[PDB]
Amino acid sequence: MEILKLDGEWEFKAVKDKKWRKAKVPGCVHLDLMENGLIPDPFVGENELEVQWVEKEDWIYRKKFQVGKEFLKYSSIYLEFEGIDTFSEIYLNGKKIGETDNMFIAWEFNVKDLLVEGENELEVRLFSPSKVLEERAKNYPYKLHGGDYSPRVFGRKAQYSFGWDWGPRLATSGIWKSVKLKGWNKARLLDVWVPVRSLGENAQINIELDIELQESIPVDVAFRISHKKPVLEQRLRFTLPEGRVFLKIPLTIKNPKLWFPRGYGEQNLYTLQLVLLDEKGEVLDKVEERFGIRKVELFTQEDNKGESFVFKINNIPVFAKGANWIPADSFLPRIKEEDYRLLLIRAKEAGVNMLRVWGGGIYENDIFYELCDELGIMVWQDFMFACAEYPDDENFLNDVQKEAEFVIKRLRNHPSIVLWCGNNCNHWGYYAKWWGEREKFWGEEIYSRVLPDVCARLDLTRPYWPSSPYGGKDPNSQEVGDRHNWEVWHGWIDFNGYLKDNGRFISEFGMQAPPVAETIRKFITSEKEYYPQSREMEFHNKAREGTERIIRYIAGHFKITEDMNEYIYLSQIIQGLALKTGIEHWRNNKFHTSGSLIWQWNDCWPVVSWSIIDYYKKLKPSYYFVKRAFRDIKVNIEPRNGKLLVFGVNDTLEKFYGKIEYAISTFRGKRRGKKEVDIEIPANSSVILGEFNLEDVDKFKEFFYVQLYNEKDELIDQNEYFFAPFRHLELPNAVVVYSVKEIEENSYLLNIESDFLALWVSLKLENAEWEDNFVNIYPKTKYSIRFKAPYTLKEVESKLKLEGYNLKKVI
Template identity: 40%
Template structure:
């Protein structure tokens, strides 16, 4: 039986005149930070003060010994080395690495024994390697002034328009000694599909041997043997029908049923090795057929079309070794609780840890996985080509058990930007990867999942890659150059990226920035704004809707409100066009440090108001009022397996919110469909069906809403009740202004005259009810616009 000795834990780190204790998995930055050798790079402009770390060479050291049972073979296994490393054991070089995204295995049988042997992992700066490769293959264009396309490493560690430049190095995933005899399971690749009320398992097992013996593999599902395979060669493939299983379904479409699949490698009755994962059976297709409007892009799971209510995912920490299963589960449950059913793992980050995909499996979250290419021309020559192939084969195999993974995507924006930014094509730039190498690997190793060449991509060079009428589309003219109302100008087939910026929660911003006074354009605030002319775009985005804010607090409130209004405008417009528009993937769910960005959850894990708005606009049943053909309609959005029937109440109110008249219309909306109900124009329209409500403001008046606020102490926090005598637009309670650990259950709330709402504030400490009356804890749009400060 395979034996393992974990080598995670205590190591030593040496480099640039520094010698400190180190923790593996980890990184140089986290080790230096833990020992107080560098300042926190998340604070002020400390990012610049620690830039030297990424340009230095480093060595991790510890003694190792094999204390397990005697085996014919002892391997040293690294699940992740970041990035350019030489591995030495007792003075012997085992090998060199050039790829953060691969696993490495070295035979150390003759080098490791019962006594301790020195193990060293020498890391060369990623900058040194990138410049070396650049000198070999020549320069290539990219969207950022860093050489990330010359090295197989997390691209955004070199900085992005929402991230710091913190170029890491280290043993970033677990490391172990592994002892085995006779044979081991080198790879297991289960492709589980579902059709005609039965599951199908397409199973490939690859074997590494020390002896040529007749072996077999016992295959079990939930502990029950379903077959036994004779292993006459080093690779065997079997296709098995699995009757009686329940299909895995995405959120809102049924149970995400999972089964434990076990492969036991046997020599006679002696167990040599064991592989075990939770998996599920489902079929996945993407309808990319032509129609009169262009080319569809509709995800089908188990034969049923799914409207994708998605978010883009970036690494949740600039130092990904700090991620834990608990943190993955927290963030992914937050996505699910916001109504999300699809997570796109963006191509400038990493192939996430196994825990990420396991949690998505359990929650029924669909995963769209980019291969790791983003916003650049990538050389197709050696030494990169073979690394790309090895990396793709490694990760396609590693992620194959996960039913949540539904599509492989070749790259982020490279096919589009190559033409849009007039990047030269006299040198290789990555097209071969996306249109040949990667689809061939997926076709060989994972034909159960559809492959797409890129995002955006129109399907062929017959159309411009970012053509809204053909397949996937990224909407960035809005935000970069246009007001968010222009989202309504088009109906793309599938919106894979769009978004609007806002600063993080107030406490997150204040904790990261020591500027006094802290202003929208003070040095620390600008340092934590990485987008090109980001603050200028925020200001230009406010201008069509509000006067320039008079204080930092008003700027913070209004830019957060504008983010919510912008994203709501896009999602509700496009969702009302289902199935013509078959999905939206908001940029972005999360942040990896405290920054002004497009995220719904900020870098400290606090919810921006956008998070609560996502929960409303991605609800299975929702209402929205839209302009169609010169008039207004109520779009009744029913993404539910049952019809939605009932009395739709439509109210016309004046600008002060007073009722003018109301009508009731009986509606019956079929499952997974949208109904459009014409309504008259008016200054303020209100549509209500069951517990759902939609508002439409043709003209806006910001009179005093006459708010009264009462706060009651309850176990764990406060219940804050807000009553309005007038129209109260966009009431917001910011819980982090009461206590750094406080949370609330709602974002912006609009109250009609006479209405009340209760906001539930919870915190890890007792809260003073009077604190809700402190400046800017609770305010509303009229108060902000009247004075620029809370009243």
């Protein structure tokens, strides 16, 4: 089968304007208007407001294309819109072909008869989603309560696009994925899947083929499964009748090289190569498809305090270190593989087991799931429903089930995908008071019947789980299932309160923090708006009372500041500490609490929000805290009623021997505690390592600390405790003494020592890839923390600045 793809440039105009302007085909209306200069950068200042009219208008896209006489020879031609932003009417040579209800799925159309030779005309009328949805809600028996934007629920589109806590109202339409014209003769591989049927010292496997035959024809399927070198090969023959045929073909892989997530093994991926072909030897459809071999179990077994909730890949239980993933741009077609690659490798090296693809953005581009596959980053896939009362009439349930079929059928092969999730927050929402005392949980049947059944039907390999918080009697309970901890941010509770949360799996929690100055500067329109509570700063904070929350949190541990640059450093470290102090505690429980998923990995535009990496892909400082908090092997401190209580954590398949040091030094002076001999941390477990009573501690002159050494020279982790908020600590300004070695042409090695306790030193260098940063430096220790700068020159990396809570600097 041959593919003429209609990607490239199209012409487009408002439903009723005269001019046809130029447009790009994986596109948005907004993009094309930006490119033609017709509307300002919505991401800048208060331009969101300027551009609300786009949303309200209907739109027409049109391409003219040239088709051969050769090409019409193909006995069937179907037109395939890989993705399309919701509501559309699509005409070919001035004749209808179908509506589209849906952004999240492919739409395919039979056109052989309507096609003519030479020039052709494809016309796509894109309806204002605002207008279309508010009609659909007006027509509906009841009124349904969303959030910001209620009628959102009545259509199948990216729920964030109408505005969120961290997104803006850029409700874009557009042909948001490839448009292919496909021509084929006799038959076509329709789907291919390679489920592991059951596993052991040897691996049993099926190959599930859908095939759509038009004539009743003899066919040969021939395949080769390959790891590095081809492990297996086979040919088979069928004589099948016209229609959709399905086959499960068993086969065996001896000594299977088994997929594991990062840190618990290797990311072995088999490749399947399969050619459908004719009786005459002529190939009809090929398909490469990659897959892994792995068990997944969602261990849900009762105990004292409630019920477990733990992932078990290949029978090893992994604590899920992670973060919630959200669309990387408000206009989706600008995200390039470059971008996904950068955010995901940054996750990898921060030490991330898992990403929850949050059910309010989208089902991702294949590039996302195929990197997650390679990098060992398991994913928690939500079905795209979030924080609202959805419709639940038959007409709708069919649309939903139709999409669920497609989505699963697409993503099934990715060994990274570890769970299917029904929704975000709805069961919690109805069970709590938000959206009222209604008897009908509006949407329940989607979560209860529709989805579990389509999941059970098409994918035995993975657990379905009906809701993003679904912890027992009160869906957010700490006894059963997973938990969303918004006590801390949204309720205002001090972030130390994460210590009193013992939920079986924290799938959501976070703290806000404004981006790096560079990023800030790109969206503020003036230097007069560069102050913490400016119109443009609060306007770029879509959380109801976000800035005053940030300012609250800063004011827990710190002296308030009116200085913009101080505020940024201070607020961003608070973010680190909130995340740190939570992440550390959940890990200290280990399998009582078998998971921590940070509430924001990325941003979809330049905004003050929970994200640990901003829209322009510039690491918040909290990223380095999160790397630290995820260190595969780690020591944490944790109070208990006037007695401190250190911990030891292995996220590794092998027991660890190594020395710890306690202490309780002053900010100058020298320790008041016991250096320890060898300690063991057993494989894949948290262990209590030490106690240390403190019934006469000088809270404002002293601080308890811990350092962890592996069997070699090396510092592998450290940690500290303070007994009073930083602002009251009689903490002398330190002086730090750094120097810079060069290990390989662009790799460097940074050496630091400090007199007194210096805190959160901030290594600034325009394009560096720091292995660690925003660091505490203790008296009596010298630190060798490596980096690189594949940008700057050998003498110019000594134009490196650095700052901290308490400083003077030297060399």
